[PDB]
Amino acid sequence: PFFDVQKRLGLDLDRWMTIQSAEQPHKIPGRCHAFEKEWIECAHGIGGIRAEKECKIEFDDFVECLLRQKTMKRLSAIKRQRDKLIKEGKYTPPPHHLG
Amino acid sequence: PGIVELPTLEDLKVQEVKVSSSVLKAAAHHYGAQCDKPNKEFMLCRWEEKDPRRCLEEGKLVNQCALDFFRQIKRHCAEPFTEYWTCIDYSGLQLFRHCRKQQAKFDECVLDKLGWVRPDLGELSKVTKVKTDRPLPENPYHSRARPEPNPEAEGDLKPAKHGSRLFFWTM
Amino acid sequence: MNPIIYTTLIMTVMSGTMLVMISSHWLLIWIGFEMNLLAMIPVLMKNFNPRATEAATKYFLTQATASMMLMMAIIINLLYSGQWTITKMFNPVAMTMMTMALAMKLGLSPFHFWVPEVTQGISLQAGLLLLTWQKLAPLSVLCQISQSINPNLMLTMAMLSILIGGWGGLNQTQLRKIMAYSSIAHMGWMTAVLPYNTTMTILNLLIYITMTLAMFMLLIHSSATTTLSLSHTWNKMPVITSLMMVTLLSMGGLPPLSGFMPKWMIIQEMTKNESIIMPTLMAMTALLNLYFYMRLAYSSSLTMFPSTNNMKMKWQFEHTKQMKLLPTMIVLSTLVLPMTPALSSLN
Amino acid sequence: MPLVYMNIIMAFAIALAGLLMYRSHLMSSLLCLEGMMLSLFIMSTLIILNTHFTLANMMPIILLVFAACEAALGLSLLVMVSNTYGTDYVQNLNLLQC
Amino acid sequence: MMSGRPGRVPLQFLPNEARSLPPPKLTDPRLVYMGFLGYCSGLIDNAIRRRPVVSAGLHRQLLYVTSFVFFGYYLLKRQDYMYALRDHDMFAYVKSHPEDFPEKDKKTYGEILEEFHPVR
Amino acid sequence: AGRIASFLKNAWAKEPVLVASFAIGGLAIILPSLSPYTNYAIRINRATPYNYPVPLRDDGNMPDVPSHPQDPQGPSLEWLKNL
Amino acid sequence: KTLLHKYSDIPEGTECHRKAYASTSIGGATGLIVSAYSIALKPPASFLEGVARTGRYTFTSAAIGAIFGLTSCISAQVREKPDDPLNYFIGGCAGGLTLGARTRSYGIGAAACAYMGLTAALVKMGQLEGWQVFAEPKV
Amino acid sequence: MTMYIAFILSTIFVIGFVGFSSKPSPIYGGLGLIVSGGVGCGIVLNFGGSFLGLMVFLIYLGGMLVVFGYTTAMATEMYPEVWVSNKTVFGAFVSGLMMEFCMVYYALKEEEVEIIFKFNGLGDWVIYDTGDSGFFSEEAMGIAALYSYGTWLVIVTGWSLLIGVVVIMEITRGN
Amino acid sequence: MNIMLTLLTNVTLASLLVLIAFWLPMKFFLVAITFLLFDLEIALLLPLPWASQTNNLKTMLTMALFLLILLAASLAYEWTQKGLEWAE
Amino acid sequence: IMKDVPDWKVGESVFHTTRWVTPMMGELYGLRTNEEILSATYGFIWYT
Numbered sequence A: 001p002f003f004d005v006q007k008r009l010g011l012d013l014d015r016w017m018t019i020q021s022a023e024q025p026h027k028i029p030g031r032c033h034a035f036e037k038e039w040i041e042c043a044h045g046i047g048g049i050r051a052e053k054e055c056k057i058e059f060d061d062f063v064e065c066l067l068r069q070k071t072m073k074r075l076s077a078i079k080r081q082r083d084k085l086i087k088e089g090k091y092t093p094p095p096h097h098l099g
Numbered sequence B: 001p002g003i004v005e006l007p008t009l010e011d012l013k014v015q016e017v018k019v020s021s022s023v024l025k026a027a028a029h030h031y032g033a034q035c036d037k038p039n040k041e042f043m044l045c046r047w048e049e050k051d052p053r054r055c056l057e058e059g060k061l062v063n064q065c066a067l068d069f070f071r072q073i074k075r076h077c078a079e080p081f082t083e084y085w086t087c088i089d090y091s092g093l094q095l096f097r098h099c100r101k102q103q104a105k106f107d108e109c110v111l112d113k114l115g116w117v118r119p120d121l122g123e124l125s126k127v128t129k130v131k132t133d134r135p136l137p138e139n140p141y142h143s144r145a146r147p148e149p150n151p152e153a154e155g156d157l158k159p160a161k162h163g164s165r166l167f168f169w170t171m
Numbered sequence C: 001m002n003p004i005i006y007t008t009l010i011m012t013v014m015s016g017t018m019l020v021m022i023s024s025h026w027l028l029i030w031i032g033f034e035m036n037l038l039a040m041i042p043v044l045m046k047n048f049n050p051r052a053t054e055a056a057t058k059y060f061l062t063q064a065t066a067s068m069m070l071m072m073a074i075i076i077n078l079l080y081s082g083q084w085t086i087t088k089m090f091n092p093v094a095m096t097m098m099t100m101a102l103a104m105k106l107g108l109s110p111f112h113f114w115v116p117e118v119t120q121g122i123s124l125q126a127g128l129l130l131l132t133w134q135k136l137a138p139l140s141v142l143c144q145i146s147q148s149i150n151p152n153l154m155l156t157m158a159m160l161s162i163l164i165g166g167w168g169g170l171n172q173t174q175l176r177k178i179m180a181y182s183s184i185a186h187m188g189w190m191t192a193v194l195p196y197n198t199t200m201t202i203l204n205l206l207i208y209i210t211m212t213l214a215m216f217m218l219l220i221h222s223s224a225t226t227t228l229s230l231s232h233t234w235n236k237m238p239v240i241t242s243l244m245m246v247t248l249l250s251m252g253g254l255p256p257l258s259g260f261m262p263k264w265m266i267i268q269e270m271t272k273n274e275s276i277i278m279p280t281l282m283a284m285t286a287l288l289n290l291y292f293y294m295r296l297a298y299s300s301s302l303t304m305f306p307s308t309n310n311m312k313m314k315w316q317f318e319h320t321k322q323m324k325l326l327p328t329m330i331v332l333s334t335l336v337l338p339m340t341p342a343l344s345s346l347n
Numbered sequence D: 001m002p003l004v005y006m007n008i009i010m011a012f013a014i015a016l017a018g019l020l021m022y023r024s025h026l027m028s029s030l031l032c033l034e035g036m037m038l039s040l041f042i043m044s045t046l047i048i049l050n051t052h053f054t055l056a057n058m059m060p061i062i063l064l065v066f067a068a069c070e071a072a073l074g075l076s077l078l079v080m081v082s083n084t085y086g087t088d089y090v091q092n093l094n095l096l097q098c
Numbered sequence E: 001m002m003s004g005r006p007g008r009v010p011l012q013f014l015p016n017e018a019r020s021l022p023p024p025k026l027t028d029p030r031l032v033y034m035g036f037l038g039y040c041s042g043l044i045d046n047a048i049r050r051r052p053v054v055s056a057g058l059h060r061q062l063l064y065v066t067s068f069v070f071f072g073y074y075l076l077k078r079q080d081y082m083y084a085l086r087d088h089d090m091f092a093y094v095k096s097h098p099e100d101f102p103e104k105d106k107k108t109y110g111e112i113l114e115e116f117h118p119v120r
Numbered sequence F: 001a002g003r004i005a006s007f008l009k010n011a012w013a014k015e016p017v018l019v020a021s022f023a024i025g026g027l028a029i030i031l032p033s034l035s036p037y038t039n040y041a042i043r044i045n046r047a048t049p050y051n052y053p054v055p056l057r058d059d060g061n062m063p064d065v066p067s068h069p070q071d072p073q074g075p076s077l078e079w080l081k082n083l
Numbered sequence G: 001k002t003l004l005h006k007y008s009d010i011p012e013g014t015e016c017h018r019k020a021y022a023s024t025s026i027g028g029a030t031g032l033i034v035s036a037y038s039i040a041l042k043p044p045a046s047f048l049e050g051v052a053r054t055g056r057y058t059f060t061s062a063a064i065g066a067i068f069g070l071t072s073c074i075s076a077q078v079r080e081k082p083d084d085p086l087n088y089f090i091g092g093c094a095g096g097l098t099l100g101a102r103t104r105s106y107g108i109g110a111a112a113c114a115y116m117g118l119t120a121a122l123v124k125m126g127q128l129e130g131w132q133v134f135a136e137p138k139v
Numbered sequence H: 001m002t003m004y005i006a007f008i009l010s011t012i013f014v015i016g017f018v019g020f021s022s023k024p025s026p027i028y029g030g031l032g033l034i035v036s037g038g039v040g041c042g043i044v045l046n047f048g049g050s051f052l053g054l055m056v057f058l059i060y061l062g063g064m065l066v067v068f069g070y071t072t073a074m075a076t077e078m079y080p081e082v083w084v085s086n087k088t089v090f091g092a093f094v095s096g097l098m099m100e101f102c103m104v105y106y107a108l109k110e111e112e113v114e115i116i117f118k119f120n121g122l123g124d125w126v127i128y129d130t131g132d133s134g135f136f137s138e139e140a141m142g143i144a145a146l147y148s149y150g151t152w153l154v155i156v157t158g159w160s161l162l163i164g165v166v167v168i169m170e171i172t173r174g175n
Numbered sequence I: 001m002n003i004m005l006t007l008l009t010n011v012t013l014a015s016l017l018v019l020i021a022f023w024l025p026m027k028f029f030l031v032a033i034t035f036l037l038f039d040l041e042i043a044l045l046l047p048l049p050w051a052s053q054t055n056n057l058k059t060m061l062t063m064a065l066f067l068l069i070l071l072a073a074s075l076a077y078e079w080t081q082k083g084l085e086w087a088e
Numbered sequence J: 001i002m003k004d005v006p007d008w009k010v011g012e013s014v015f016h017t018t019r020w021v022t023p024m025m026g027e028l029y030g031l032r033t034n035e036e037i038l039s040a041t042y043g044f045i046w047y048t
């Protein structure tokens, strides 16, 4: 906050939902709660400019959990190279693939 | 970065309990009340290890004790069970409310024939400890080393040297 | 309006910006911007004249659109980090998105054509509120996220304000139009220094705020909206025109008046940041502002202008409004240069 | 990233272009401004529901209840320029030339 | 810059560390300047309201001078505190980062060859 | 007093819908405060296991937590049973 | 800024054809921006007048870029001065004279020579040196 | 097909925006948004979010947009342009068509669309997570916190709506 | 799917039997805007049923009733300052 | 399937951590026929 009356008065108005690892109704996880716990707990008391450097590995994983860019891009390589093998008959699917 | 370890399909092959939902829910109270320690061991392992592959063995025992529970009742009044779980099946939401007499029929063998007891409301929801063997994981989250916090300020807050030091302002 | 109902509209917007400067959550910041807009519209149309109806429509469409652009800047940052807190932004296009979105709420770059028309339509009393309080809310967010700002992105916005504010100000006739262009020119000064050190951004804001109230409430006392109408006030109220001249010199920036407060430190600050061509252009093009300050100064007090016979009747009656805080606002905007090292208090 | 989000993202952009370009009528511009917050609503719900950010479900309901407040203000201003000028055409709204 | 240094209790116009500074003397040249501004405020206040300038409600002048000096005096305390704070945390970083501020070596002007460009 | 009572009487004479609304809204705001079952409503609200009762590592020295689900130790909702 | 990178990558004077094409590309792109604004803030009568405004503005700007890049490069290696700001000084006036003929006024042509000639030397002036117009916030 | 149903709906969602972004007659523009509003809920519905989706029908489509076209009904000129009318309106419509066709074609062949945001072109379904939700709906239990965690939200959004009621009269009063 | 099938079948039946019937043979604004603001305020307390089962329903009681008195407050100000007595 | 592809470490870790990340359905079902994908993802949502 520009004027952090939040901290001075010691009463919460907005930080409850600011992160998904905070308190949740009936204790349900926010999908990537495990990863962002590591990143935030990496970044406390480190400073903004420092934390972006050292806590980069934690942030990259947390983005990959949240954003899920490369994981399905790799899965794209799974499917694209799959149909580019079945179409010429080079690959046959085992029977657990169907039922 | 690197291979992700996956348990082989060999030890993965485990006797799966081949019963439906109605039979499970009808005897759920007695099943939870009697064979519960292996469930608690596996339940604690899943929340502490946070890694499913670490506690797969305890998962087998969770099923294994389930077969033992179903085996004992099979030797006992299986016919009242067939009556009990069929009427439970005939409920869209599987409500225990409709099935009361057949529920009593099942309950009145196990109390004396099997020596069991229907758990009242609350005991199955009680938060209970479990005496286990597996030690506490060193760091279940697999946390890495923390960055060193910047050193904090120390020393008496001395006056600014030679005033404001902003252009010609002497003080 | 009903005095009690105009009061809450005056200070619902007081609270709307108050939320922005204290909110640590991105959504809540938009909430304060919403009440900022929701309470600004009625005040602009207190008098209900077609100028105000146009001015409200132009103001609403601009601010609403900027607010919407701000939201997707919030969403994209959420989409790429899942963080609702206000910190440095974690994605480039989101950073680029809100800089323009926040700019349009403030209005410095080509997103400034609304500023002259809206203040021209609306009354002078609501003019100061639009030109003074409605700039802290966008600036508070910008000072907050200044770390992630794009240095190229902001600075070109900064000059295009001062060059446009400097150039078009010469041709303006209506005093509100001149005041608006100077506000655009002044807006460029602290926005340029914003990426380097926000302390001077706040320092420029405070001084500029003090100068603008001194300008607006004196004009309210003059009851004049045109240069010729302001020119006549030399005879009825010669003292006001003399004070009109000193604040014009101050808000021009000539030393040792308080207009040399922001520029000098801003010039010094960027010079420490190796940006030296940048200050020279702004300091030199600031003279464009001084020219129509001189033009107003010449017609107000330095040379008396022809008056009308009917205004002998004006001398027969005293003023009514007490124009609260006018004496302290003038002095706090002319002779505060020797108190320059007080800027350390802000940081 | 899933093409449904890029479908939403252009939906903002085409809505953004319509709001900025203008043709004749402020009704259409107000309509274009509503597609803005609309596409924002699905985009907000889509991310928030996908990530199971339970408290963040706050924002979708909060988003449009305040976006609808623009309609409460925007619609009102239109009828006034409609009462005075006649048709609410943007070309009519040019009195503040100076 | 400040802003978020370790220990930043918000909306604190005078943090407790400021009590360890020499308080601004009442005869401070900066402090009396606040008093001078208060007088100028009083003169304008009578001038704007068509009052007999100097001898026109001296009670208002007293209030203006008192407010400016009092509001001034607390300002210098914060002004001196932040200025002292800037140098304090400064003087410790150089110790913690000595290789970041290497000390020069003694070389008198007798050995330094400053080129002499003739002037005509 | 007299005027206030007459004010209510003429309020009921010509405006009976609003006095019904204000009375109901007036009550509906103050019985929940001094209600004796409000704490009961909270008690049964927390006594609804949406989330699993995750077990705790038995390190001893804690007698309150039951070792067995059917064990007498631990909380009970016998109050919920009769009410 | 790949378009701006073209001019910087090609050595001064050498490869005059590449410098000329890159320089007029910069001018043409700049002409597009100003012409687009001109139609926006001040609409013409119809579309045919709109492209007419674009045609004039783009042709002027492209001409300034073409003549500046050509003169700057052709003066560099001819004089064997790959660093002297004068290599851009006559370039600025080359654009300045080019603008003057484009709008057909001697007075504006001389002023454009003086102003562009100074700025072109100044733009070169910073290229040899470390002058930054958008310096990053080091402090 | 059925796997791309969210993609199918998302495609109708985009072309629905071109319907009203082209700025046709205000009634017809509203209709183009009405369908666009309708399909957008289905996109939300396919992701869960029943309550959040249902509002788009109720308080926006049957809500905000009802009074929207209602205002267009008693306002506007006596000659409402039919969608074809001005060649610009149809030019805008076909213009919207070529943007969605080029990206979708680019999306389904190379899957490496980088326009502004780099987005990989896979099916809608490769983004869903996994896990059981127990006995509580995630959406339902989230916005039900309006009165358990939504403290500062309710205080501010309620206050502004009251100011919303007062601002609308003050502008519509006519002084 | 079933939901889509149901709505699709309804449209065709309406479309089919329409075709056989075609080939074989400020006050007005104020009521709109006041409804709009009340309707938006109504959407706030729609999640009330599940919200009534929160574990801190005491805070729910203060604030769920809060919105309802504001509904009354918005109408009360509307009523007293003419408002629902539409222009006539 | 990717023995032939030049550069591919079989079972390459996606996240830098060695902790078990919950495996999203995309890698789970994936290869499965569209009937399995259709019934398992939008199964709860379309069940009525």
Ligand SMILES: CCCCCCCCCCCCCCCCCC(=O)OC[C@H](COP(=O)(O)OCCN)OC(=O)CCCCCCCCCCCCCCCCC
Pocket (backbone or CB within 6 Å): C237, C238, C239, C240, C241, C242, C245, C246, C301, C302, E043, E047, E051, E052, E053, E054
């Ligand atoms: C930084 C550089 C300078 C910047 C400022 C420059 C200002 C002037 C620039 C030119 C201005 C335009 C041209 C002239 C405009 C004149 C305006 C005007 O109103 O003039 C006429 C007017 C007539 O005077 P009148 O209002 O009747 O009041 C007389 C005193 N009762 O005159 C007035 O109203 C003026 C009244 C002045 C009153 C002065 C009072 C002085 C009091 C001195 C007190 C000293 C105490 C010493 C204490 C010592 C111990 C501590």
Ligand SMILES: CCCCCCCCCCCCCCCCCC(=O)OC[C@H](COP(=O)(O)OCCN)OC(=O)CCCCCCCCCCCCCCCCC
Pocket (backbone or CB within 6 Å): G004, G007, G022, G023, G024, G026, G027, G028, G030, G031, G034, G035, G056, G057, G060, G061, G064, G065, G066, G068, G069, G095, G103
């Ligand atoms: C080595 C790298 C560079 C190599 C190439 C050389 C530099 C680029 C080319 C020259 C750019 C600057 C010269 C001006 C170009 C634009 C000219 C233009 O717009 O002309 C049209 C018009 C002038 O005529 P007008 O006043 O309209 O009167 C006739 C009306 N019928 O215009 C106007 O009326 C408005 C005034 C002109 C437009 C605004 C200013 C445009 C130029 C800004 C600086 C551009 C710098 C480019 C290079 C650095 C950045 C890449």
Ligand SMILES: CCCCCCCCCCCCCCCCCC(=O)O[C@@H](COC(=O)CCCCCCCCCCCCCCC)COP(=O)(O)OC[C@H](O)CO
Pocket (backbone or CB within 6 Å): C274, C276, C277, C280, C281, C284, G122, G129, G130, G131, G132
């Ligand atoms: C009426 C117009 C002007 C009239 C004549 C006035 C005097 C002519 C020259 C004006 C000089 C203005 C800029 C001088 C400010 C201080 C600059 C200085 O001390 O020298 C620096 C010179 O550096 C500069 O680039 C300063 C600016 C040079 C000139 C460009 C801007 C001024 C000209 C345009 C603006 C003024 C003209 C009017 C335009 C309308 C040294 O820094 P450096 O470059 O060595 O930095 C270290 C390292 O190399 C990284 O750079």
